[PDB]
Amino acid sequence: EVETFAFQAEIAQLMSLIINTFYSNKEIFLRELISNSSDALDKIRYESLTDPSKLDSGKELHINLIPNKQDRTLTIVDTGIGMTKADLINNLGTIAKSGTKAFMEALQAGADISMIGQFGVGFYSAYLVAEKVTVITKHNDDEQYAWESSAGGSFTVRTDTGEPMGRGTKVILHLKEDQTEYLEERRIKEIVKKHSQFIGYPITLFVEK
Ligand SMILES: Cc1cc(O)c2cccc(F)c2n1
Numbered sequence: 058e059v060e061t062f063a064f065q066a067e068i069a070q071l072m073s074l075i076i077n078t079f080y081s082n083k084e085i086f087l088r089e090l091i092s093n094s095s096d097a098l099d100k101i102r103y104e105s106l107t108d109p110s111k112l113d114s115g116k117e118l119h120i121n122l123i124p125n126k127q128d129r130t131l132t133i134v135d136t137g138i139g140m141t142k143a144d145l146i147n148n149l150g151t152i153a154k155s156g157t158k159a160f161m162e163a164l165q166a167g168a169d170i171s172m173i174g175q176f177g178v179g180f181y182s183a184y185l186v187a188e189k190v191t192v193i194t195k196h197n198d199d200e201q202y203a204w205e206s207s208a209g210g211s212f213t214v215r216t217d218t219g220e221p222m223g224r225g226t227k228v229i230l231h232l233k234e235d236q237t238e239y240l241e242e243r244r245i246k247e248i249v250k251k252h253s254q255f256i257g258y259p260i261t262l263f264v265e266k
Pocket of ligand 1 (some may be wrong): 204
């Protein structure tokens with residue numbers, strides 16, 4: 058059973074701006090998604106200080122980067138707090154509304170797309186390099202869900218029957234045809250060193266076979 062939802066108007070316009078604007082500095086998508094993972098890991102770590110049982114679903118706090126040339130996907134996995142169905146459908150969009158309005162005002166005043174994270178909507182920079190984004194996520198208080206969107210104004214949510222995750226978020230970037238440089242090991246290493254070198258969790262770059 059797949060549910061289809063319309064993005065809020067303002068988030069749809071943000072997605073179209075990210076997809077349609079000419080802007081060559083696309084590599085910042087990775088810093089933004091790693092920042093998302095770090096924030097999610099911070100959150101479950103803090104909550105575990107007063108309720109250790111929140112780590113029964115997994116004690117390790119880490120980030121994995123997994124390129125796949127055969128599928129043309131780059132996957133960012135973290136064992137953070139995860140997202141609930143209400144997060145995916147309602148809560149995150151409510152936050153992204155005011156962040157989008159502020160980001161677009163800043164752009165018209167002279168800011169550039171690389172500053173998207175200062176407005177809390179860095180997740181959407183995934184569409185600099187991805188034609189489709191799939192998010193698998195499991196929060197301690199909810200079921201495992203798959204969220205998916207190819208932009209165009211709509212996203213889907215369903216219950217995920219795939220391999221159980223324990224706790225956390227997997228972001229699967231289905232890369233655009235001309236963006237395969239981000240499946241190369243040396244390229245990913247360069248970007249992580251440049252933009253994410255002080256992240257407070259182990260980042261493991263998987264090698265392909
Ligand atoms: C971090 C983050 C922020 C958002 O607005 C999202 C919206 C839909 C799905 C996501 F995974 C999201 N993640």
